[PDB]
Design a protein around this ligand. Structure first.
Ligand SMILES: NC(=O)c1ccc[n+]([C@@H]2O[C@H](COP(=O)([O-])OP(=O)(O)OC[C@H]3O[C@@H](n4cnc5c(N)ncnc54)[C@H](OP(=O)(O)O)[C@@H]3O)[C@@H](O)[C@H]2O)c1
Length: 342
């Protein structure tokens, strides 16, 4: 009945492991080093948790050793490992290759060592594999769970943004191709999850560092910006709360109606200024210690960019998503409280 989760040291994955342990699952995470495994075991202090070391998901047959050891006990797989940080001049090596190869490696290990034992795979894709980046600001485009990012391998590396979005798109395409080509050989059913920009508190307070890795540094950077910093008030993207994402991953292998589904996890548009506005409304005593409030944002003028049709996703998951204001508030409170400022 064990659950394997790849990339278990990350921002989203630490919340997923929390949820799994809340529900009494035995959990095997993969992390890059013994260092990280040791630190995590001390943070969770839970005997149902263990880690295996996978230093590089891109390398040959990277997940085989896990299934040679645990193949008989792994019933569910959450494939969450894909690069979010990467060298801007190593867009294949650091980004597209590990995204794709990590996915192929996970699925091929299941096929080779546990084709009839693994029942469900839940893969973290992205809003990036559904949306068209250059139409982020186009309200005449409506996206739903069947829409695909049309980026080509030829044009994928326009910039770091298109390249990351292509890494998610190409990896997810390979995932569905595998499931189509192996429906007779392997038992597992695939569910993919497609978060927008993920915000919300770190799973552990102690992991709030001066500079955050990943998407929450958007918030943390604005929170510490000098008062006179120029803040953009134009549409940035869609967001989703990390705790909604984590809850969805676990439902993803539990609920029969999520089999073969792409789940579009966005809950609203924002600009940098909409984030800053929460600072000023919710922590008025600190006004002046970060950039000021300005209600003139795209969002407040009814400008939210390409449209999100995720009614099917919301109906299947059934639970209400966390509103933007709370997600930002909880992120900011955790930082300011850790700093002793509130
Ligand atoms: N807004 C978001 O944050 C967002 C939105 C949509 C989808 N996602 C997807 O959610 C998943 C986790 O993202 P995150 O935001 O939680 O970022 P994160 O904190 O950087 O987590 C990424 C995890 O994957 C590991 N990883 C990445 N590349 C690896 C590689 N080549 N080999 C071995 N391990 C590797 C990382 O380990 P190390 O840190 O040790 O390298 C880490 O454990 C990813 O699949 C991401 O594409 C994120």
């Amino acid at each position: 009945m064990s659950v394997l989760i790849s990339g278990a040291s990350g921002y989203i994955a630490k919340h997923i492991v929390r949820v799994l342990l809340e529900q009494n699952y035995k959990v095997i995470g993969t992390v890059r080093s013994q260092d990280k495994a040791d630190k995590l075991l001390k943070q969770y202090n839970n005997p149902n948790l263990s880690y295996e070391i996978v230093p590089e998901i891109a390398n040959l047959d990277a997940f085989d050793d896990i299934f040679k050891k645990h193949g008989k006990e792994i019933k569910y797989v959450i494939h969450a490992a894909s690069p979010v940080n990467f060298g801007a001049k190593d867009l294949e090596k650091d980004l597209v290759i590990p995204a794709i190869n990590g996915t192929k490696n996970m699925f091929e290990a299941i096929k080779k060592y546990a084709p009839d034992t693994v029942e469900r795979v839940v893969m973290t894709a992205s809003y990036a594999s559904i949306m068209t980046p250059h139409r982020n600001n186009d309200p005449t485009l409506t996206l739903d769970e069947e829409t695909w990012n049309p980026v080509t391998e030829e044009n994928a590396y326009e910039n770091v943004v298109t390249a990351y979005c292509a890494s998610k798109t190409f990896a997810e395409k390979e995932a569905w191709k595998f499931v189509k080509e192996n429906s007779d050989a392997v038992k597992f059913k695939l569910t993919t999850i497609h978060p927008g920009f993920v915000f919300g508190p770190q799973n552990f307070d102690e992991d709030v560092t001066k500079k955050l890795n990943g998407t929450c540094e958007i918030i943390n950077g604005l929170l510490h910006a000098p008062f006179d910093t120029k803040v953009e008030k134009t549409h940035f993207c869609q967001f989703i709360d990390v705790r909604d994402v984590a809850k969805t991953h676990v439902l993803g292998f539990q609920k029969d109606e999520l089999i073969n589904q792409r789940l579009l996890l966005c809950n609203g548009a924002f600009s940098q200024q909409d984030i800053v506005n929460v600072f000023n409304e919710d922590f008025p005593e600190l006004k002046g210690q970060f950039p000021p409030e300005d209600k003139d944002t795209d969002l407040n003028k009814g400008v939210t960019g390409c449209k999100i049709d995720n009614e099917k996703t919301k109906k299947l998951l059934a639970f209400e998503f966390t509103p933007f204001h709370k997600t930002i508030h909880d992120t900011v409170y955790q930082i300011l409280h850790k700093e002793g400022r509130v």
